[PDB]
Amino acid sequence: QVQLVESGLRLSCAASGHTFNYPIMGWFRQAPGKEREFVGAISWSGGSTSYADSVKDRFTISRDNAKNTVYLEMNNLKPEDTAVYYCAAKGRYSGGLYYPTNYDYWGQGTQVT
Amino acid sequence: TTVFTRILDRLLDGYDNRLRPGLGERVTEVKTDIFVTSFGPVSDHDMEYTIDVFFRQSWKDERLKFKGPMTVLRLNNLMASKIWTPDTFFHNGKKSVAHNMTMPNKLLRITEDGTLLYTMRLTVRAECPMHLEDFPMDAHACPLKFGSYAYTRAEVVYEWTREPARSVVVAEDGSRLNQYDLLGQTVDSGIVQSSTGEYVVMTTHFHLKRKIGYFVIQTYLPCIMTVILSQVSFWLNRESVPARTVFGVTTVLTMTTLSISARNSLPKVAYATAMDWFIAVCYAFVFSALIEFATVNYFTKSQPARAAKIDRLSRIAFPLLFGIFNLVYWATYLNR
Amino acid sequence: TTVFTRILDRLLDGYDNRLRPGLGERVTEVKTDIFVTSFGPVSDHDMEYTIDVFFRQSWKDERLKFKGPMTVLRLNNLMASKIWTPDTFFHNGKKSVAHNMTMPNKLLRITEDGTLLYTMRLTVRAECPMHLEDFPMDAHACPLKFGSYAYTRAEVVYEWTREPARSVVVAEDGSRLNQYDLLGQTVDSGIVQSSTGEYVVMTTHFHLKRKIGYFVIQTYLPCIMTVILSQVSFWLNRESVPARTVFGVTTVLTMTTLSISARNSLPKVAYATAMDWFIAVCYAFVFSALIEFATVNYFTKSQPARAAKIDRLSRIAFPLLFGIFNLVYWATYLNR
Amino acid sequence: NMSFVKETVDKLLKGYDIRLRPDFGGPPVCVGMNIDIASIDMVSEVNMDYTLTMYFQQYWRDKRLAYSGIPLNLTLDNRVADQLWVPDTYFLNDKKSFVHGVTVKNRMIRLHPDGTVLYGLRITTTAACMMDLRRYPLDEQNCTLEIESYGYTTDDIEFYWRGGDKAVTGVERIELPQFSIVEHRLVSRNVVFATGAYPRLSLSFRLKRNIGYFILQTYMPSILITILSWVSFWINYDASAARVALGITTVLTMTTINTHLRETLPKIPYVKAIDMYLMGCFVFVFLALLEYAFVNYIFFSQPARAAAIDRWSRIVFPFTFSLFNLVYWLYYV
Amino acid sequence: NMSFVKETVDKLLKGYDIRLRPDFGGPPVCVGMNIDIASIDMVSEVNMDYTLTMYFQQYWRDKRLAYSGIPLNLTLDNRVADQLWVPDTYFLNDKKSFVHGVTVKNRMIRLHPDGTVLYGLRITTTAACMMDLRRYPLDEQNCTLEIESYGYTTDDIEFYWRGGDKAVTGVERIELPQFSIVEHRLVSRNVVFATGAYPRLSLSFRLKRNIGYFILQTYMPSILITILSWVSFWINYDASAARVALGITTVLTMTTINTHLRETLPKIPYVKAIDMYLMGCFVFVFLALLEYAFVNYIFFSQPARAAAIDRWSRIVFPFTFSLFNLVYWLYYV
Amino acid sequence: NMSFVKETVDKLLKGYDIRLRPDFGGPPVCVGMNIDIASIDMVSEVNMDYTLTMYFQQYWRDKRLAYSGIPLNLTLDNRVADQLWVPDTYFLNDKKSFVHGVTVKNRMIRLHPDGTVLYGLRITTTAACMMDLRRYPLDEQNCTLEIESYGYTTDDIEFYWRGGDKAVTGVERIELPQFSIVEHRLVSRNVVFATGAYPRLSLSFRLKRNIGYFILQTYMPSILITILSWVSFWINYDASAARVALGITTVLTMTTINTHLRETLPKIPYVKAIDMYLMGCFVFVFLALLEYAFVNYIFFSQPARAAAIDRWSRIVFPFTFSLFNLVYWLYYV
Ligand SMILES: *[C@@H]1O[C@H](CO)[C@@H](O[C@@H]2O[C@H](CO)[C@@H](O[C@@H]3O[C@H](CO[C@H]4O[C@H](CO)[C@@H](O)[C@H](O)[C@@H]4O)[C@@H](O)[C@H](O[C@H]4O[C@H](CO)[C@@H](O)[C@H](O)[C@@H]4O)[C@@H]3O)[C@H](O)[C@H]2NC(C)=O)[C@H](O)[C@H]1NC(C)=O
Ligand SMILES: *[C@@H]1O[C@H](CO)[C@@H](O[C@@H]2O[C@H](CO)[C@@H](O[C@@H]3O[C@H](CO[C@H]4O[C@H](CO)[C@@H](O)[C@H](O)[C@@H]4O)[C@@H](O)[C@H](O[C@H]4O[C@H](CO)[C@@H](O)[C@H](O)[C@@H]4O)[C@@H]3O)[C@H](O)[C@H]2NC(C)=O)[C@H](O)[C@H]1NC(C)=O
Ligand SMILES: *[C@@H]1O[C@H](CO)[C@@H](O[C@@H]2O[C@H](CO)[C@@H](O[C@@H]3O[C@H](CO[C@H]4O[C@H](CO)[C@@H](O)[C@H](O)[C@@H]4O)[C@@H](O)[C@H](O[C@H]4O[C@H](CO)[C@@H](O)[C@H](O)[C@@H]4O)[C@@H]3O)[C@H](O)[C@H]2NC(C)=O)[C@H](O)[C@H]1NC(C)=O
Ligand SMILES: *[C@@H]1O[C@H](CO)[C@@H](O[C@@H]2O[C@H](CO)[C@@H](O[C@@H]3O[C@H](CO[C@H]4O[C@H](CO)[C@@H](O)[C@H](O)[C@@H]4O)[C@@H](O)[C@H](O[C@H]4O[C@H](CO)[C@@H](O)[C@H](O)[C@@H]4O)[C@@H]3O)[C@H](O)[C@H]2NC(C)=O)[C@H](O)[C@H]1NC(C)=O
């Protein structure tokens, strides 16, 4: 079991428990009328980030295993970035990186305007 | 020669090899027997053994009765693929080989009453679960179990061709064992159950005994000699402090080195073997002898009479206890 | 498209692929060429080498003439299994692989005059017997020989497509060699007679030269420094007996350690390499230095003047002889 | 009457198209599954994989194969499997699998009157299992087997464990040398790739390592070597050859045990607990040798101080070693 | 209706010539590639290769397979792939490859109404990667996969990465203990052989080696032995036995470490950076021993000069060792 | 005139029944055999086997294949072997074998006008050879190849060596690094099993191991190290560092040689000659080290006794080592 705690512009996702079985953390955002949208993903060990097109060159993702945290730094914001943000954990054989169904442990929703 | 071709064409005319003989009317009976041409090496680390066999099956198929100038047709083995054959498999096999050089190593013979003899040459790797509590004085019964994969006991049964003890024949020069000795085999049959039903299983147990010579001349003799060497110190006069100190330290170092080197050919079992107990006892004896010498040396210059008494008592107690321990251990393990 | 389907069906109508082109009339001529995409690792222990090639063959079949909108049909390699092809094999091949991922790595092209181009991608492991008397300053000619398996010189002959030197082409960046340099290759053809008849054989020799830097900085430099360390002993005064004893013993031990590690790496051969001679002479020098120290010690107390003279004369003689020996050794084994 | 059976089987396979799934164009075909684990042979930390042999049984319904007038299950020769549709089941995390083929292909086809097909295989598979060795040898691992459809999406095929938690049998009989199977779990879910959603069955085992082998293999040898190193303090300080021989032999044995340990493990870039323990033991033996060096250094002019230092080290080193063992075994338990 | 689809597919395959490519005799057929990386099992320097597992997807259009009246995409049983034309794609630098075949051959065929074919395979390949180990173990490698058409030239076939930069996924699934992935790159080009010009796709990864504990596990022992060899400078020159013993022990220990280390590392035949470092440390310890030899040679007639030479060696040797370390770590980092 | 040849060949295979041997129902068919041995790669002691590459030619007569009007011997495409009858020849003692398949299957079929068939294959086989290693490395082995008919008894077939004692060629050109082929023998006999009597051909080689490698690698280093251990007796007892360094180095070198060699052989339970020699050398060097340790412990109060004990060891050890060498080389030669 993994417990995710969200804080935070910069958002921090701190995970506890079985972070070895879920080696990938991903970020999603929900619009008021739209479904959840993938933002980016980070590997706990490999540090290999992946980003969606709409936040390329603007958002950055970093990981530190000292206290098991992943940081999403958002820069050059826009009014089309007002969505409730979520952090989630993905299993080792869970499939595609862009689909919310494949992520098991979801954090609490965080609002951004 | 045309007569035999016409006979074979008529035999195969309308034959359906998807159906076993006697389907819906009777059980198919298969007589089996094994000729071991070589009982290959045993791998203790992998808990497995390799065996090379002629596997022989025989059964009745009324659809293949014929009448002609000969009573037995010894056919090319391709005919085997045109008729029905039993789907025998080895339950504890790991990765077997059916030899195909220079041709498929199979033979098929048809007797005029419809009897089929079907023989193949196989190399089977099989699991032998070993318990090593009595190591290196352990004995094992390595099994080989086979039976039908798809046909339950209501459809196919297996029987040994002759007396069960005489249906598994080992070649006289067919032994590739280096560490074990094959003492014999026990042959049996029974019923297994599974989620798909009840099946007949034929079982052969080969009885293997580990040779002890390597471990006698590699571990037991040096341990015995080290214990005796440590006990010689009890007979040196109490003034000869450097000699007894050299004895003690050298024997403890040798025992530690042998104990560390002792587990180099064994599987990573989670329990202790008998040799481990022997080595532990030898270490305890050597260490206690060194502690005895230390105690004697401590009292040498203040209570020499007490030191002499301790030496005299130990000089008798240590060998007697070592002899009783050896007696009990060897009686326990060589008579089991 | 249907035109090409009809053309292909007409080519394969009444075509017997059991018969070579020109059977009973003339000799089938096969033109061959090789493109080496990678010259794989060389194994000294197994005496073999691996090579990856595009193998290209071309011949003429009158039965496959056609007339259509296209001049060359570049067909799916399945067609190659429906026509005659040569049965070329590598005489000194050990175990080769015709690559099959994701499809058979084969190509067939048919020209309207009946000319066939047939190409395949192969990995060949071939035997290269090595004479290691000059190791590690040796050079080898690893051969690759191929020809027909079943057709004698009266039925099938092989020729190189262009001039023999230009018929085998090695890619620029296709070197997988680690400890060898590919200096070049020679190309030839000939006849080999065996129990079944005379056969055409095509041969390509690849010339390899081992690089020496690793063994220079792995064995030769430590040995030279050990010899120099041993020769250092002549400068200690004759009063310092423990120092000179330590020098001699430790230098001999270092030479032993170098020799011990110097033997693990090499392959097993029943003759002496150049490295073996070098290590033997270095060992002899270190032992002779120790013997010289023993001689000096023997005369030290009875004839000190003689000991001083002998020590000084050895102090001068030994470096000069070692330098001359090194010059002779390297001149002999470098310009071989 | 075998002729009627032959005619019925010929009729079932007349015009049968194996390119099409059952109920093609309609609702998804439901495939049930079950596994009998025969054995789990070898678990390798070096390769991060395990080997497993099993009887794998699939059940489905094909209305094209329904027959009447024969009140029996029809077990057919396994070559009929080449003339039927079967599911395209595969294992995601496997590295090399094969079906046993002696004496024939270990395959079973059983038809039922209502059209139910039972398809059985005997499979030996090596499967990947990434291991967390930060607490080795006091670690616990989770090894899975992932079962998925390759070509068919969830709109064509559905998986389910046939019998719930009873669908996997034979786990309690498995005996492993280095491990014991604490628990096994069965999961069913869906997985989305770029080409659609696919059914997924997961079978997971949790393995707890037995400690006895490591007690026998590294812990006891280290303790015995450390005690041997403590034997030096009871030999008189003027026996230089004996005590230096003792120190060199103990250091060499420590190095040999450490090299064996690291040989049996993958080349991970971080420090493990056993590495910490082994370098603690190395520090202890090195400190004992350095203590002898000091005593030999200062004993020419102050024999009493050297004797006192040796005597006090006789007590201090066992006590501090006991404290280090206490701390080590308290931080990990 | 299943019979209607059955006859539609029978009509599709009726008159189909598998020996001819789509648009044979006309414009080249375009093939789009996709790769989904599952894992990289191992990277071997001794064998100079790496093992990769992947889903390999090919996309093309064959007008002979167009069908109408069914507004659906036909996912067919993979055996139908034996009756269709497929590209003759191969990997140039691969050494041994297989398609997984449990429970069936891991193959996928999907047809679309306009004639588009999607063809998927699950492949494990051991591919060659010539590594330059001159900076080993501080080295950085570049390993590639070359995808090519064997028989069809650029007049017949074209390759392109389907989706551009997004054509390769799963790079974050690569978990190597000894390496980390820094970057991956996609390349498209043409290659000229004596038989014509062929399309070529290239997928490259840049591997960075992880340093940690294992880097120290080797370089530190030599430095520590060299420092112990420097301990001789502070011991007075009347102790000829002690100082000679120190020099010989340090020299022989250096030789033993070097020989065992080389017996341990992979058996590359060429000389690495670490070999040069170890040889430098050997040179330093040998020079220290030679310095002591000189001091012993001259101190009986010029003790003041010998004391000055020792004092200056005391200062010079640590300084020169620091310079050597500085130059080495500047050159190799 | 390929039309007439095609007519003749099609006529030959028209009514051919591959299921029946030639002269089915009559006298046994005679099969002559030739072997051309190309190489012997590996003679393994650990695996107890050897590898052989050969050209295996079979010769027989099938009257169904006689033809007239074509004054040529017809070499046919090797695939025609799949339509003719061939003997079911197998090797009894083979563990793993294969026919070479590059570029095609290395097979030859040659028909003759009178109906004679020549059938050739190129085969690599690993064959089991149990070895007696009691005299290793001065041992002599006898390795065989057993060629037999599987299904046909002596009433259907009979083997013979075609050409007498010249049926096997290429023996005189084999080069083995570790062995020399002293002799080869050919035998023909019958073997009875429960299913009848079968013809058997046996090809045996007698291999003699070369000793130069083991003299170079193990015996000479061991002798040199033993003499080095005897060097201590000629050094004075006050030089503690030299003698202790010598003893520790010799002991560790003996252990390294012993372990490194002993880990190159199979786990046989008996003692080989080299094991006995190495154990004796280890005993000698260990006793030299113990003698020095004892002398060093008591050379302060009793120097004369230490000098006498050293001098007697100095004389006793070479003589007993000479006696041990004499007994060993008299026992094993
Ligand atoms: C590249 O080349 C390799 C060989 O170098 C091929 O591997 C062979 O592939 C063929 C074709 O698939 C195999 O032949 C077929 O095997 C079927 C059984 O397969 C099982 O059993 C074999 C061993 O007997 C295993 O190797 C295999 O993994 C399976 O467990 C037979 O049923 C086939 O017979 C029937 O084939 C069809 C009908 O299906 C008809 O022609 C006939 O009815 C025929 O009787 C057939 O024999 C062969 O076994 C494979 N060998 C090996 C060593 O793997 C690759 O497939 C090839 N790759 C490509 C892309 O072409
Ligand atoms: C080794 O590690 C793996 C992970 O790498 C572990 O696998 C996880 O196991 C847990 C259970 O212990 C799984 O959690 C459960 O997942 C079920 C499936 O999720 C889907 O369920 C349906 C599917 O249609 C949908 O709702 C949706 O798609 C879900 O995503 C859930 O149904 C479970 O929820 C319910 O579980 C039970 C009832 O079934 C009750 O507790 C509650 O009702 C609860 O709501 C549950 O969430 C988890 O999904 C697995 N992960 C993966 C990646 O498969 C192994 O367990 C572990 N091995 C060991 C021995 O510990
Ligand atoms: C591992 O090492 C390999 C080499 O062994 C590296 O592969 C090279 O990667 C570079 C890109 O980083 C390749 O360079 C590119 O080649 C493309 C194809 O060239 C062909 O086509 C062009 C026309 O399109 C012709 O001009 C040319 O002659 C070829 O026929 C080019 O299209 C690319 O052009 C880009 O750069 C130029 C400027 O140089 C710009 O003008 C363009 O707009 C464009 O941005 C480019 O030149 C190179 O070919 C690859 N080599 C090989 C042998 O394949 C790997 O990158 C490396 N891996 C890692 C991770 O570093
Ligand atoms: C490696 O070790 C193997 C044994 O494992 C040796 O093989 C043996 O070789 C000898 C010959 O060197 C074989 O002896 C021969 O057996 C033949 C068959 O015997 C059967 O038939 C005869 C009648 O023909 C019966 O009397 C007999 O009982 C058997 O039923 C004999 O025909 C041979 O006799 C021939 O030579 C003698 C003279 O020597 C003549 O008098 C005879 O008339 C006849 O011409 C002969 O006796 C023996 O059978 C082989 N053993 C096995 C198990 O095969 C290898 O030689 C050895 N390798 C090396 C290099 O030494």
How far, in Å, is the centroid of ligand 2 from the Cα of D187?
6
What do you get for the CA distance between the two ends of chain C, in Å?
65
- Provide the pairing of β-strand D196-209 with E29-44: unpaired
Which two three-digit tokens encode residue D302? 């102050």
Approach to solving:
cryo-EM
On whether the CB atoms of residues F70 and F5 are closer than 8 A, the answer is yes
Using DSSP's 3-state secondary structure scheme, residue C199 falls into strand
Q: Are D202 and D189 in contact (CB under 8 A)?
A: yes
How many CA atoms within 13 Å lie on the side-chain side of E254? 32
Burial class for F274, CB neighbours closer than 10 Å (0-12, 13-18, 19+): buried
How far away is chain F from the Cα of E54, in angstroms, using its nearest Cα? Answer: 28
Inspect the interface and report whether the beta carbons of E172 and A43 lie closer than 8 Å: yes
Three-point CA angle B194, B195, B198, nearest 5°:
45
Resolution as reported, in Å: 3.5
Q: Any long-range contacts for B263-267 (C-beta under 8 Å, 24+ apart)? A: B263/D216, B263/D217, B265/B44, B265/F267, B266/B44, B266/B132, B266/B135, B267/B44, B267/B45, B267/B47, B267/B132, B267/D177
Cis geometry, peptide bond prior to residue E255 (ω within 30 degrees of 0): no
Contact B189, B217 (CB under 8 A): no
Compute the distance between CA of residue A26 and CA of residue A106 in angstroms, rounded to an integer.
10
How far the first Cα of chain D sits from its last, in Å, is 70
With beta carbons less than 8 A apart as the criterion, state whether B115 and B60 touch. Answer: yes
* Of residues D174, D210, C35, the one with CA closest to residue B271: D210
Token duo for residue D260 = 């064996």
* Contact at CB, B260 and D257, closer than 8 angstroms: yes
Question: Shortest CA distance to B26 belongs to which of B122, B150, B154, B142?
Answer: B154
| Beta bridge mates, F103 | C89
Q: Is C111 exposed, middle or buried (0-12, 13-18, 19+ CB in 10 A)?
A: middle
Is C124 in CB contact (< 8 Å) with chain F?
yes
Q: Can you tell me which residue has the tokens 């102090």?
A: C315
- Quick check: F277 and F141 in contact, CB under 8 A? no
Q: Phi/psi at B246 (nearest 5 deg)? A: -65, -45
Largest CA distance in chain F: 112
Listed residue (C125, C123, C166, C167) closest to C142, CA to CA: C125
Structure tokens, F275: 């094991």
- C272 vs B182: CA distance, rounded Å: 45
DSSP state at residue C102: B
Please report all neighbours of F, defined by 3+ CB atom pairs within 8 A. Answer: B, C, D, E
Task: Give the H/E segment covering residue C209.
Answer: strand C197-210
Ligand 1 site residues, Cβ closer than 6 angstroms: C 100, 103; D 82, 99, 101; E 101
Of chain C residues 146-185, which have a CB less than 8 A from chain F?
149-152, 155
Backbone angles phi, psi at F39, to 5 degrees: -160, 160
d(CA D101, CA B28): 22
Classify domain E2-210 at the CATH class level.
Answer: mainly beta
Q: Collapse the DSSP code of C114 into the 3-class scheme (helix H, G, I; strand E, B; otherwise coil) and give the result.
A: coil
E strand or H helix at F191, and its extent?
strand F179-193
Contacts of F124 in chain C (CB under 8 A): 94-95
- Tokens 């029944």 correspond to F17
User: Was D180 annotated as part of a binding site?
Assistant: no
Please list, residue by residue across B237-256, b when 16 or more beta carbons sit within 10 angstroms of its beta carbon and e when fewer do.
Answer: ebeebebbbbbbbbbbbbbb
Question: Would you tell me how many other CB atoms lie within 10 Å of the CB of residue C233?
Answer: 25
Query: Which of C142, C90, C102, C100 is closest to C121 using CA atoms?
Result: C100
Give the residues across from E183 on adjacent strands: E206
The residue contributing the CA closest to ligand 1 atom 12 is E105
Interatomic CA distance for residues D121 and D34, integer angstroms = 11
Tokens coding D195? 């080409």
Contact partners, residue B172, CB within 8 Å, separation at least 6: none
* Alpha-carbon span C229 to E110, nearest angstrom: 76
Rounded to whole angstroms, the Cα distance separating C272 from C263 reads 12
Joined tokens for residue B280:
């532990």
Q: What are the DSSP E strand ranges found in chain A?
A: 2-7, 10-17, 24-30, 36-43, 50-51, 59-64, 69-74, 84-90, 103-106
Chain F contact for B12 (CB, 8 A cutoff): no
Residue that the structure tokens 């699998």 belong to: D97
Smallest CA separation from ligand 4 atom 28, residue: F189
* C-beta atoms of A43 and E180 within 8 A: no
Which domain does A27 fall in, by range? 2-106
Residue B79 identity: M
Chain F CB within 8 Å of residue E248 CB: yes
* ∠ Cα B200 B202 B208 (to 5°): 150
F272/F268 Cα distance (integer angstroms) = 9
What fold is seen in the domain E213-332? Methane Monooxygenase Hydroxylase; Chain G, domain 1 (1.20.58)
Closest CA to B124 of B227, B52, B209: B52
Q: Tell me whether residue A95 is exposed, middle or buried, using C-beta atoms within 10 angstroms of its C-beta: 0 to 12, 13 to 18, 19 or more.
A: buried
Report the distance separating Cα B120 and Cα E69, nearest Å: 55
Question: Is D193 annotated to bind ligand?
Answer: yes
| Separation of CA A1 and ligand 2 centre (Å) | 10
Calpha distance D245→D256 (Å, rounded) = 16
Amino acid in position D289: L
Q: How far is CA F286 from CA B202, D29, E295, in A?
A: 57, 77, 36
Backbone angles phi, psi at F290, to 5 degrees: -65, -40
Q: Answer yes or no: is the C-beta of F197 below 6 A from any ligand 4 atom.
A: no
In angstroms, rounded to a whole number, what is the distance separating the alpha carbons of residues F218 and F221? Answer: 6
Contact, D124 vs D102, CB < 8 A? no
Residue for token digits 């299904």? F151
Rounded Cα–Cα distance for residues E200 and E189 (Å): 5
The residues with which B207 forms a beta bridge, in sequence order, are: B141, B184
- Count how many residues are written for chain A: 113
Ligand nearest D97 Cα, by number? 1
Q: Name the residue with tokens 């200690």.
A: C236
Q: How far apart are the first and last CA of chain B?
A: 65
Of A21, A90, A102, A106, the one to substitute when testing ligand 2's pocket (max ligand atoms within 8 A of C-beta) is A21
Q: CB-based burial of residue E74 (10 Å sphere; 0-12 exposed, 13-18 middle, 19+ buried)?
A: buried
- The verdict on a CB contact (< 8 Å) between E241 and F245 is no
Taking the Cβ of residue A1 and every Cβ of chain D, the question of whether any pair is shorter than 8 Å is answered with no
Domain ranges, ordered by start, for chain D: 2-209, 212-331
CATH number where A54 lies: 2.60.40.10
Tell whether A92 lies on the interface with D, counting CB pairs under 8 A.
Answer: yes
Q: Please tell me the distance in Å from C16's CA to the nearest CA on chain F.
A: 7
What is the number of other CB atoms lying within 10 angstroms of the CB of residue E117?
Answer: 21
Report helix, strand or coil for D135: coil
Which residue minimizes the CA distance to atom 39 of ligand 1? Answer: D82
Instruction: Judge: D151–E102 Cβ closer than 8 Å, yes or no.
Output: no
Domains detected in chain C = 2-210 (2.70.170.10), 213-334 (1.20.58.390)
- Start-to-end CA distance of chain F, whole Å, equals 71
- Class of residue B173 by CB neighbours under 10 A (exposed 0-12, middle 13-18, buried 19+): exposed
List, comma-separated, the residues after which chain E is broken, a break being a C to N distance over 2.5 A; otherwise answer none: none
C244 to chain E, closest Cα gap in Å: 9
Are E169 and A48 inside 8 Å of each other by CB? no
Q: What is the spatial order of strands in the sheet that A59-64 belongs to? A: A2-7, A10-17, A69-74, A59-64
Judge whether B189 and B201 are in contact, CB under 8 Å. yes
Question: Does the annotation list C121 as a binding residue?
Answer: no
Three-state SS at D10 = helix
- Looking at beta carbons, which residues of chain B come within 8 Å of D34? 195
Let me know if chains A and B touch, i.e. at least 3 Cβ pairs under 8 angstroms: no
The number of domains in chain A is: 1
In sign, the C-alpha dihedral spanning D306, D312, D314, D317 is negative
In angstroms, rounded to a whole number, what is the distance separating the alpha carbons of residues F167 and F145? 14
Distance, CA of B202 to CA of B34 (rounded, Å): 11
Q: Are D130 and A92 in contact (CB under 8 A)?
A: yes
- What secondary structure does DSSP assign to F239-286, as a single string? -HHHHHHHHHHHHHHHHHHHHHHHTTS---SS--HHHHHHHHHHHHHH
Instruction: Kindly state if the Cβ of F185 falls inside 6 Å of ligand 4.
Output: yes
β-pair partners for C52 = C38, C123
Do B and E touch (≥3 CB pairs < 8 Å)?
no
Residue to mutate among C195, C259, C275, C298, with most F CBs inside 10 A, is C195
Of E172, E174, E175, the CB nearest to A50: E172
SS3 content of chain D, % helix, strand, coil (to 5): 40, 30, 30
Asked if residues F13 and C22 have their Cβ atoms less than 8 Å apart, the reply is no
Interface test with E, best of A43, A56, A97, A98 (most E CBs within 10 A): A43
Q: Which CATH superfamily is domain F212-331 in?
A: Neurotransmitter-gated ion-channel transmembrane domain (1.20.58.390)
Distances D118 to B146, D61, D80, D111 between C-alpha atoms, Å: 22, 9, 13, 7
Mutate to test the interface with A, among D136, D139, D192 (most CBs of A within 10 A): D192
CA-closest candidate to residue D154, choices E68, A101, E120: A101
DSSP one-letter code for C304: H
- Of D151, D91, D157, D160, whose CA–CA distance to D124 is shortest? D91
- Specify whether the CB–CB gap between E74 and E5 falls below 8 A: yes
SS in 3 state form for chain B?
CHHHHHHHHHHHCCCCCCCCCCCCCCCEEEEEEEEEEEEEEEECCCCEEEEEEEEEEEEECHHHCCCCCCCEEEECHHHHHHCCCCCEEECCECCCEECCCECCCEEEEEECCCEEEEEEEEEEEEECCCCCCCCCCCEEEEEEEEEECCCCCCCEEEEECCCHHHCEEECCCCECCCCEEEEEEEEEEEEEEECCEEEEEEEEEEEEEECCHHHHHHHHHHHHHHHHHHHHHHHCCCCCHHHHHHHHHHHHHHHHHHHHHHCCCCCCCCCCCHHHHHHHHHHHHHHHHHHHHHHHHHCCCCCHHHHHHHHHHHHHHHHHHHHHHHHHHHHHHHCC
Strand partners for E296: none
**Rounded Cα–Cα distance for residues C61 and B87 (Å):** 48
Q: How many of the other CB atoms lie within 10 Å of CB of F130?
A: 16
Which of these, C209, C206, C208, C214, lies nearest to C275 by C-alpha position? C214
8-state DSSP, C132: G
**Which numbered ligand comes closest to the C-alpha of E101?**
1
HEC assignment per residue over chain E: CHHHHHHHHHHHHCCCCCCCCCCCCCCCEEEEEEEEEEEEEEEECCCCEEEEEEEEEEEEECHHHCCCCCCCCEEECHHHHHHCCCCCEEECCEEEEEECCCECCCEEEEECCCCEEEEEEEEEEEEECCCCCCCCCCCEEEEEEEEEECCCCCCCEEEEECCHHHCEECHHHCCCCCEEEEEEEEEEEEEEECCEEEEEEEEEEEEEECCHHHHHHHHHHHHHHHHHHHHHHHCCCCCHHHHHHHHHHHHHHHHHHHHHHHHHCCCCCCCCHHHHHHHHHHHHHHHHHHHHHHHHHHCCCCHHHHHHHHHHHHHHHHHHHHHHHHHHHHHHC
Place of tokens 């910069």: A10
Residue nearest atom 61 of ligand 4, based on CA coordinates: F206
Phi, psi at residue B253, to the nearest 5°?
-65, -45
> Where does chain C have alpha helices with state H?
2-11, 164-167, 213-215, 221-231, 241-264, 274-298, 304-334
Sign of CA dihedral C272, C275, C276, C282: positive
Q: Does domain D2-209 have CATH number 3.40.50.1000?
A: no
Helix (H) or strand (E) holding F220: helix F220-230
DSSP class of residue D14?
S
Give the number of other CB atoms < 10 A from CB of residue F249.
25
Verify whether the Cβ–Cβ distance A46 to E169 is below 8 Å.
Answer: no
Please indicate whether, in this complex, the C-beta atoms of E241 and F240 are within 8 angstroms of each other: yes
**Could you say which of B176, B214, B246 has the minimum Cβ distance to residue F293?**
B246
